[PDB]
Design a binder for this molecule. Structure first.
Ligand SMILES: Nc1nc2c(ncn2[C@H]2C[C@H](O)[C@@H](COP(=O)(O)OP(=O)(O)OP(=O)(O)O)O2)c(=O)[nH]1
Length: 174
DNA sequence: GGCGAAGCCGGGTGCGAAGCACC
């Protein structure tokens, strides 16, 4: 497996050096539009897979990062994942790892963070628990009888206090 | 089976044969 320092280093590398294609040209990606996801946030001592969160604030460029996102001078294979997820194979130091990224709207950030930070069952439990509150909670926002309702916050306690739930630490397992 | 507002159970797509399998 990999190590925290390496994860942090690659995270730093990705945090200070990413890049993406743009209408035939290329644009670099730095820290403010990038967040980390993985064992580090869950606090694991064994790094299986280290992920990241990359959201776009612009409504158009949101889909401009989607085209071709990459780094300068490395081994990487990027394919589509799931529905609209990004599956990357990364090779460096003669080593290849599997990175599953996701790029979404900056407003999805809290929900995204919440969804991405803990466990599916909690997510579903939370989803149903919340749905049963007569509201459907998805990356996009809150859906009500096919109606769409967006978020008003940008933070975690904010999101929990926004929906009306408590923040449970992964280590407690739901 | 377990549940905070009553009756409920994520969201979808890349394929391979429209049905299964991952994030
Ligand atoms: N694999 C998987 N990921 C899901 C699911 N639902 C939501 N996600 C999220 C979790 C992450 O935000 C992203 C998947 O990342 P990974 O495959 O690396 O797993 P995750 O990061 O949750 O665990 P980790 O801390 O990296 O070992 O999609 C699901 O059902 N399966």
């Amino acid at each position: 497996m990999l190590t925290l320092i390496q994860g942090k280093k690659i995270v730093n590398h990705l945090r200070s050096r990413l890049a993406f294609e743009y209408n035939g040209q290329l644009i670099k990606i730095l820290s403010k539009n990038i967040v980390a996801v993985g064992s580090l946030r869950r606090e694991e001592k064994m790094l299986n897979d280290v992920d990241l969160l990359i959201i776009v604030p612009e409504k158009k460029l949101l889909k401009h990062v989607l085209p071709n996102i990459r780094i300068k001078g490395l081994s990487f294979s990027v394919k589509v994942c799931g529905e609209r997820k990004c599956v990357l194979f990364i090779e460096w130091e003669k080593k290849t790892y599997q990175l599953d990224l996701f790029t979404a709207l900056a407003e999805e950030k809290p929900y995204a963070i919440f969804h991405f930070t803990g466990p599916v069952s909690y997510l579903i439990r939370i989803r149903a628990a919340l749905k049963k509150k007569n509201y459907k909670l998805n990356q996009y926002g809150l859906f009500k009888n096919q109606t769409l309702v967006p978020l008003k916050i940008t933070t975690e306690k904010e999101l929990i206090k926004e929906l009306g739930f408590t923040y449970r630490i992964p280590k407690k397992r739901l």
